[model samples]
Target chain A: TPWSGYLDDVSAKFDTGVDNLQTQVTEALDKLAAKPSDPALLAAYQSKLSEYNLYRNAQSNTVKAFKDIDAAIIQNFR
Target chain B: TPWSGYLDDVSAKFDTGVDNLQTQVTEALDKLAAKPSDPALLAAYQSKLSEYNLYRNAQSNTVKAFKDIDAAIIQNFR
Candidate 1:
């Protein structure tokens, strides 16, 4: 139960982080789409997009790291 | 001479692919910066950015695959 709860907490954090970024990306795109002439809008979109990419990279690295850890553990057993 | 020529040809292809993409990315960004109010500009920028990202990913994968191929070759010798 403890391990399950811990996993749920971690998963929820990532879910919410990505969800928030998704919202920002959509909002930024929408504003830029509507105004099309505001430097601020484009800048905002670029900033959000970059942030989302970082989050994605982190998410992928986290999974890769977990697998690597698991592999290390297995090697230790051998 | 044949092997060296082959390597140069392969390297040239990659260099040109990335250079072309880099040009697109720069041009799109410049246009978008100048006229932030056109949907076309935004779309163009997005398209070029996506294309550039694809090229970057391909470049990274090519290097990784080369190392993997080298490893395979070494293992074959063993």
Candidate 2:
């Protein structure tokens, strides 16, 4: 029997991708926090943080899509 | 064609950030798992894990964004 219950692999991939991005940004932040006064380090942090924000926005959009898909799936089920 | 690589630099940044955070968390987890009863070590693990979860949520948002963009791009290409 086929499994069911929100089996959207696309959403899963996007979710995983978001997770990967989050990791990168956090690491950069930690590194910067450790050396708050280093210009090079600060620059790196800024770049990474900026990227983090971008991905965050993207992830939000994906979630909206997921919700839509979920609604459709539920409708189909009923 | 000028260039093509998803062209979503923001998502790229977030992805990288997430990766960085994951590495940091994994490292912290490894340390704690290695010596589960050390108070100081456990404290460090808890701190890192907390931060890791935060970043993870942020990263999830980013992935959603990428999905929307991908859908738009696919439509445009067709």
Candidate 3:
């Protein structure tokens, strides 16, 4: 039961996080599209958005690694 | 050997991603401190950062779960 709870929570957290991140990316892109008149403003938006995408994708791969890890464990243990 | 290569790549990618993300966070905090002279500047910075931190934490936790899973498999199977 404890393992179930813990494992499920991890999955829930990961999914909820992914949902929230997609929203953030969309908002980042939309806000940047507004085209701030300040050079500094545009610069910050571009860099941060790009930065978000990089980490976001990395986060994605990490999620999949866990999936692979899960499969490995199941195949080997069960 | 093949599983070794795949596992190693997964480890390498995870480490690289984490390293890159830390750099992004540092740069983001620095540039935000530098400030952008626009109406929505602070909002953009805060919101993106808020989202970034949320997902980054999630990613970190997920990585840990995999580590635990690895332990589970080794200890349980082997």
User: How much does candidate 1 score in TM-score?
Assistant: 0.41
Against the native complex, each candidate's DockQ, computed on alpha carbons, is 0.02, 0.03, 0.04
Sort by TM-score, top down from the best: 1, 2, 3
The models' CA-based lDDT, in order, is 0.60, 0.60, 0.52
Q: Mark the regions of model 2 whose C-alpha exceeds 4 Å error after superposition.
A: A1-8, A15-20, A72-78, B1-78
Residue B8 displacement (Å), model 3: 27
RMSD in angstroms between candidate 1 and the native structure over all alpha carbons: 14.3
lDDT of 2 at B32: 84
Reference-based lDDT, residue B3, model 2: 16
Return the top candidate by DockQ: 3
TM-score of 2: 0.39
**Cα RMSD, each candidate:** 14.3, 15.9, 14.7
lDDT by residue (tens digit), candidate 2, A1-78: 655345355445655655455666677688888889654455445545655554555555666666777788889986
* Residue-level error in angstroms, candidate 3, position A62: 1.4
Candidate 1: give the clashing pairs.
A36-B36, A36-B37, A37-B36, A37-B37
